[PDB]
């Protein structure tokens, strides 16, 4: 008796609804096996980790819990609009769209301070920097620059992942001016990561020739790392 | 015509809205209220309260009342509120992993198919919504099976009571038969019943 | 004495304290020193605060909280208790909250052992151990006296 | 005598820096080391001796030391409510065989 | 000051428990999508927006 109005009439209101401004995401795909929602984690290099769809028991709002007993009043005792022979009505695509809109301005503005401040905190787009004076003469911002691994992680690293270009190279005792060149020839960002004894030989010189800030774990003995075979480097 | 409004950044908002849901418990409700309001708006399902259950005569019969009873308690009262909301969640975002208002049954009295039926009727009626909770339920059903199918829910639970999808779809069937707390709805496990595999 | 370095007239003592702290070893501290915070519902559980209290009263405080925390038992398993306690096959649902309601446990080994002795002295004890059941039984209402 | 006397003469003589014999608190009545994983607060290390000599192993009192206290989110002794369902039937309720 | 009365913002609510409030620091976020094992995937073009 019910499918007459139910499949034919409830179905449409549902489809029209599948397109509502806000009801975003994805709910299914008709397949019970296999379909698993897509997960979203707000991850941050600075150690933030708050996933979007987390499971946390019944909330105060009152939605979390699903209750199947609702099937009966719908199935047995609930009169319909097009079942007993009223004239199907139609929502005014206005109230409910202006409304979806109503929430969006209200909603985006609200995350406005919360999002605004963290940025003040992030200290957006800018790596610290210690420039080490090489070749006694030439002074200030005329040597080798290198920044702490944490700075590199945070600000400069996430960007690298997006461009695709293969992650940086490793300042190693062996690597010649060629390896550094080839790596920057790829990532094309001019940053080299250090994690191998002395830098020694040229290349370190090539570094004077090129920004190629070299990133390295915490500062100290950062002159005992390089092989300033002519005293200029100096942890100070 | 070219209205003089600003714009409607599809990206800023898909993501801007993203931060809000991620860290703002209340958004699920704000949204499910539009559809819920909208559905009540389309006058899609008016609700009556002149209670109509069983073929009436059943309520009156001596023997049936045992069943007149299970269904009577299982079934509730048409809340004007619950029915739209019930429909609204069919299509609206999911932000908490719905839990199944655990229905504790024993399945040991033929009149009790009433409950297995609640689900079939329910899954059919709002399946996308039902999908979230296939686990709490797969959870209820094997019990029904342990009851009405000993021989078959012998090999079935054993084949594995939960499975996963291998890099090549081949379902990897776990050999255990642990329960299924929603706690792993977001993991890589699927309740096993619904594997729909022979 | 430390919360008063370069902060007290008395020059000597101050000089040494300001110096005493200079040692490679000793290093004073104060307030919120380390936090671990439940998984699942990402809020912050037990905070380790370096408040200055003796060293003894303090260490023992950890004896209780530490044990409380060690016993991975929560307030959820509790339903298991009244679980056995009620018309064998009753049903207890939810709500269950992870490690946001840790509960000591239930020292099983102490009681029968402590309890054995309890009854050994006051033998009148059986009067109660039975008192309760009688109350429970008349309560489940399984037999009502009458003049029929 | 005087064993509880850990600090003596808090005044400053004018001539001679250290007044005639004055104690001045030992580097313990303020060493607030860490808090072992096991829960035994132990004095700050000593150039990598790692283990800080558990505060309770030696015999020096030590005002100040980490205390792990539980926050506002871990109320305990909470009277928690549950829904109990009395199995319907009775005649059904099985007792025997496991 | 903005006039957008904020409540239960950033917090939680779940009846039964308290309304324990998460943190809010966040620095820079990436709405990266997490492999099932609950651990951040390296943003891929042909799978996520």
């Amino acid at each position: 008796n019910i499918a007459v109005a139910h499949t034919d009439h409830l179905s449409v209101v549902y489809a029209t609804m599948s397109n509502f401004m806000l009801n975003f995401t994805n709910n299914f795909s008709g397949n019970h096996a296999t379909f698993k929602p897509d997960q979203y984690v707000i991850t941050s290099p600075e150690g933030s980790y708050k996933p979007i769809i987390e499971r946390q028991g019944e909330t105060v709002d009152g939605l979390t819990i699903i209750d199947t007993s609702i099937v009966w009043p719908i199935l047995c005792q609930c009169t319909y609009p097009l079942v007993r022979q009223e004239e199907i009505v139609y929502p005014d695509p206005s109230t409910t769209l202006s409304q979806s809109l109503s929430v969006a301005q209200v909603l985006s503005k609200l995350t406005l301070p919360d999002a605004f401040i963290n940025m003040i905190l992030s200290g957006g787009d800018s790596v610290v920097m210690r420039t080490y004076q090489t070749e006694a003469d030439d002074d200030l911002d005329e040597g080798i620059r290198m920044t702490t691994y944490d700075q590199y992680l945070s600000h400069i690293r996430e960007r690298l992942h997006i461009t695709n270009v293969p992650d940086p190279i490793y300042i190693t005792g062996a690597s010649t001016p060629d390896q550094i060149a080839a790596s920057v020839q790829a990532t094309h960002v001019a940053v080299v990561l250090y994690q191998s004894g002395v830098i020694n030989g040229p290349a370190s010189t090539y570094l004077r020739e090129n920004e190629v800030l070299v990133v390295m774990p915490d500062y100290y003995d950062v002159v005992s790392r390089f092989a300033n075979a002519n005293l200029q480097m100096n942890n100070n | 015509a070219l209205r003089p409004e600003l714009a409607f950044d599809h990206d800023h908002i898909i993501r801007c809205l993203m931060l809000a849901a991620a860290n703002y418990p209340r958004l699920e409700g704000i949204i499910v209220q539009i559809n819920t309001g909208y559905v009540a708006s389309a006058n899609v399902i008016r609700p009556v309260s002149e209670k109509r259950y069983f073929p009436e005569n059943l309520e009156q019969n001596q023997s049936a009342a045992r069943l007149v009873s299970a269904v009577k308690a299982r079934a509730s009262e048409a809340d004007i509120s619950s029915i739209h909301l019930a429909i609204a969640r069919e299509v609206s975002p999911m932000f908490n992993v719905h839990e199944l208002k655990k229905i504790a049954e024993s399945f040991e009295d033929p009149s009790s198919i009433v409950v297995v039926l609640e689900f079939i009727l329910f899954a059919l009626f709002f399946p996308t919504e039902f999908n979230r909770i296939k686990g709490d339920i797969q959870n209820v059903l094997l019990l029904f099976f342990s009851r009405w199918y000993p021989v078959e829910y012998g090999i079935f639970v054993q084949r594995g009571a939960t499975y996963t999808i291998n890099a090549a779809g081949e379902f990897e069937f776990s050999g255990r038969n642990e329960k299924w707390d929603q706690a792993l709805y977001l993991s890589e496990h699927f309740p096993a019943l619904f594997s729909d595999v022979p | 004495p430390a919360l008063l370095r370069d902060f007290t007239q008395v020059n000597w003592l101050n000089r040494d304290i300001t110096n005493m702290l200079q040692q490679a070893g000793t290093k004073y501290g104060l307030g919120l020193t380390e936090t671990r915070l439940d998984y699942v519902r990402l809020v912050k559980t037990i905070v380790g605060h370096a408040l200055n209290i003796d060293h003894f009263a303090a260490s023992v405080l950890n004896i209780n909280l530490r044990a409380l925390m060690e016993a991975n038992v929560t307030a959820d398993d509790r339903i298991k208790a009244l679980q056995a306690h009620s018309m064998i096959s009753t049903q207890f649902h939810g709500p269950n909250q992870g490690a946001l309601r840790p509960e000591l446990a239930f020292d099983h080994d102490h009681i029968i052992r402590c309890l054995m002795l309890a009854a050994a002295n006051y033998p009148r004890l059986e009067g109660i151990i039975v008192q309760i059941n009688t109350g429970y039984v008349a309560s489940a209402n399984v037999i009502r006296p009458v003049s029929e | 005598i005087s064993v509880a006397r850990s600090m003596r003469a808090i005044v400053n003589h004018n001539e001679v820096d250290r007044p005639r014999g004055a104690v001045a608190p030992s580097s313990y009545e303020m060493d607030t080391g860490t808090l072992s994983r096991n829960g035994d607060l132990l004095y700050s290390p000593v150039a990598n001796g790692q283990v800080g000599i558990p505060k309770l192993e030696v015999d020096h009192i030590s005002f100040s030391n980490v205390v792990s206290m539980m926050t506002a989110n871990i109320r305990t002794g909470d009277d928690m409510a549950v829904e109990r369902v009395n199995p319907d039937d009775v005649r059904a309720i099985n007792i025997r065989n496991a | 000051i903005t006039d957008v009365d904020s409540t239960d913002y950033g917090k939680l609510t779940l009846r039964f428990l308290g309304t324990l409030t998460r943190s809010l620091k966040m620095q820079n976020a990436q709405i990266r999508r997490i492999r099932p094992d609950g651990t951040v995937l390296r943003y891929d073009d042909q799978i996520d927006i």
Binding site: - | - | P95 | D78, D79 | -
Partner: peptide, 15 residues
């Protein structure tokens, strides 16, 4: 009997 969400909660358990 009635449509309600969440635990029907009817007992209080003593620590």
């Amino acid at each position: 009997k009635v449509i309600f969400n969440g635990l029907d909660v009817n007992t209080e358990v003593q620590p």
